[PDB]
């Protein structure tokens, strides 16, 4: 009967928790108690990027660390030149409710998606001059929360239905589909070798997926509410995800466990974006209380705060050079930060 | 300083000019949000004032005021995450199936869910108690009574402020106003002047539905600006 299967599942879950509890000799705080803390990180709004008509939901950095795509409820994507505060392209979308955007590593394509169930791919470098839609990737039955490019011809998505998928752009045919979840998948972060990826889905669980395999190769169940952001440590062995409670936690794939909660008693608002610094030493987190905190991935103590915004931070990205951080908030402004010496 | 840099700056100026042009259309276009059951008749009203897919956007302008009305379709059962998008809209339009006695409770549960969200606290709600003529047939030709599914209906008489259209039985008026009373019962509690609820009675054929949204949205804007000046 189903009772036997339920008991077997409960026994297996007890086994998993026993294995996780066993190999947990120390906590990252114990090891890092001798590590010299970083000082107060002061970062100033070097250049504010103005022009979105309404709230910003997503941004992504070009791989050259100068260009920048942003998405707003308006129905527009703007390609900024960070260095010169210049507009390179401005793409008018078909559906106003865009919820994600990605910049192709080669600089040739940009993606977007949202409540309209489709992921759109745009050809930036066209012989005719304008930016055109290359493909509309239909097949999902729920809002599309994150889009990330693996190559010019492969893209990975995550939508409201409990589902992430890998697409072959020249065909539009969902090479693979990823099944296991119970709620809405919110975030996504490709490894820095497009071989694995992770996703957290509105059920206090984040799953690591094999792109060529499909199998859910790991799972993590530490959180207490919805998971709103996720990213890798550059090592590829760690990812930290921020939730709709006031906690950001750090997960390691090899240990298959939680490592360190970056939370404070003074914070009650949730986390809406998480991004690691180039060295894995600074962990930026966007909050609903109008400002971005900067944490220390090893010591778990705020080393800064980016108080320059008048509304909810929504997006947060660090360059591949490690030399800037950009923040988008519901005030339609996008600010670029770096320190001074 | 170089020529190519100057030309890039000029291109950025043209882009910014087009965006400033699009402000004036973005502002001065009042977004709404249509939420309603499967049998309600949402798209019916939508087509009325206009004349795997997700959002079903529609447009209509009345007396030179732009309205940009929405409709969320193939989305999962939970309304949790994507209702945050529809913050900062002028109203939420709610349509019920008035005739189908049994589903009123599901309709009221949805109403209470929309009314008390963490977002939508400042966003008003327009009702369209739809398919009223169907209720006229349902209760004119005597059949399963409202009291069958509703206990309190036995102790209910028509309130004085009613405005029965000519040719309307005094008990059918109780039929029409009992659902309105239930939904305004939900509306009056749990809310203090930040937002309100505007009941309406609409058959499937009536044409004056765009004007009602015009008047209601005018009211929302006026009450907002009056509270901002502490005259209300």
């Amino acid at each position: 009967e189903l009772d036997q299967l339920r008991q077997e599942a409960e026994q297996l879950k007890n086994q998993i928790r026993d294995a996780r509890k066993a190999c947990a000799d120390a906590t990252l705080s114990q090891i890092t108690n001798n590590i010299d803390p970083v000082g107060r990180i002061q970062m100033r709004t070097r250049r504010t990027l103005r022009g979105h008509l309404a709230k910003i939901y997503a941004m992504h950095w070009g791989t050259d660390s100068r260009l920048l795509v942003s998405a707003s409820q308006d129905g527009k994507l703007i390609i900024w030149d960070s260095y010169t505060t210049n507009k390179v392209h401005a793409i008018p979308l078909r559906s106003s409710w865009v919820m994600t955007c990605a910049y192709a590593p080669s600089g040739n394509y940009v993606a977007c998606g949202g409540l309209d169930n489709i992921c759109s791919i745009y050809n930036l470098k066209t012989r005719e001059g304008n930016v055109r839609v290359s493909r509309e990737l239909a097949g999902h039955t729920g809002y599309l929360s994150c889009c990330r490019f693996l190559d010019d011809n492969q893209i990975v998505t995550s939508s409201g239905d409990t589902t992430c998928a890998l697409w072959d752009i020249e065909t539009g045919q969902q090479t693979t589909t990823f099944t296991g979840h119970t709620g809405d998948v919110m975030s996504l972060s490709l490894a820095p070798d497009t071989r694995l990826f992770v996703s957290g889905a509105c059920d206090a669980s984040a799953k690591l997926w094999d792109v060529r395999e499909g199998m859910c190769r790991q799972t993590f169940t530490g959180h207490e509410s919805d998971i709103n952001a996720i990213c890798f440590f550059p090592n590829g062995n760690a990812f930290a995800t921020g939730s709709d409670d006031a906690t950001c936690r750090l997960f390691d794939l090899r240990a298959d466990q939680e490592l360190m909660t970056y939370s404070h008693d003074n914070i009650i608002c949730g986390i809406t974006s998480v991004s690691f610094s180039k060295s894995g030493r600074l962990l930026l987190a966007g909050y609903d209380d109008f400002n971005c905190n900067v944490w220390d991935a090893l010591k778990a103590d705020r080393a800064g705060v980016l108080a320059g915004h008048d509304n909810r931070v929504s997006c947060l990205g660090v360059t591949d050079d490690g030399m800037a951080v950009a923040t988008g908030s519901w005030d339609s402004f996008l600010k670029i930060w770096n320190g001074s010496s | 300083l170089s020529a190519e840099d100057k030309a890039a700056v000029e291109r950025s100026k043209m882009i910014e000019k087009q965006l400033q042009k699009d402000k004036q259309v973005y502002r001065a276009t009042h977004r709404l949000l249509l939420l309603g059951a499967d049998n309600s008749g949402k798209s019916t009203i939508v087509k009325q004032m206009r004349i795997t897919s997700g959002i079903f956007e529609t447009k209509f302008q009345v007396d030179k005021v732009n309205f940009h009305m929405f409709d969320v379709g193939a989305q999962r059962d939970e309304r949790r995450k994507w209702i945050q998008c529809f913050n900062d809209v002028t109203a939420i339009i709610f349509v019920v199936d008035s005739s189908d006695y049994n589903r009123l409770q599901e309709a009221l549960n949805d109403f209470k869910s929309i009314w008390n969200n963490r977002w939508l606290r400042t966003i008003s709600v327009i009702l369209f108690l739809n398919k009223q003529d169907l209720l006229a047939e349902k209760v004119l030709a005597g059949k399963s009574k409202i009291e069958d599914y509703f206990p309190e209906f036995a102790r209910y008489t028509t309130p004085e402020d009613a405005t029965p259209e000519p040719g309307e039985d005094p008990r059918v008026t109780r039929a029409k106003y009992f659902i309105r009373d239930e939904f305004l019962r939900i509306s009056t509690a749990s809310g203090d002047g930040r937002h309100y609820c505007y009941p309406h009675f609409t058959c499937s054929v009536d044409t004056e539905n765009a004007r009602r949204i015009f008047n209601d949205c005018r009211d929302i804007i006026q009450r907002m600006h009056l509270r901002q000046y502490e005259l209300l």
Partner: single-chain antibody
Amino acid sequence: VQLVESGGGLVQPGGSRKLSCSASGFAFSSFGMHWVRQAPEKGLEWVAYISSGSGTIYYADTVKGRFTISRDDPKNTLFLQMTSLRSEDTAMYYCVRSIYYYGSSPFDFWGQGTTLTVSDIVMTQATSSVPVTPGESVSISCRSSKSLLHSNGNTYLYWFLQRPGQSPQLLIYRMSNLASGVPDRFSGSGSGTAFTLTISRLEAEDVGVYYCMQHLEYPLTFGAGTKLEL
């Protein structure tokens, strides 16, 4: 993309004539245009410029108070109103498109040309002819008066190739890049004053005249050509 322009022929000295360039196949409003001219047996020479939005217009010293440039975005045509034509205006006028944003490739398409016949920075191409046999690696040079390396990293040297009876064609933009449809053989290097264009394995479709242009500041000035014969 396809640009054709017409409006040339014999004109008595002192007259006037309008040249029109009918663009079709690309978003004309997003591109700024140029006019470049080629004397009957000489090199290239920049003539005018009108930008996207029609807001910036430049000319050359020898046509400035005498020629005007205008565009019609809805009709996808570009004009050049020549007035009081002198005998030094016999040339093969071209209609060159150029878009300027971060990472663009200016001078990426050249029209076929129209024939007109009337009855500050110096770019030196000391060489003027090079014999070569197929499969040998060539190296064409070009020198500058000022230093073209602007403070922002760009070098603003352009290289072109016009084959025996064809319109020119972009090979290198900003001294180190490759146009869209150009073989990997071509490669350009330079220091900031002295420049080279190195073909790896020459083929019979590579014979022609190679031109170097600067784009640091107006006016734009060309070389004299470096013909490769076979």
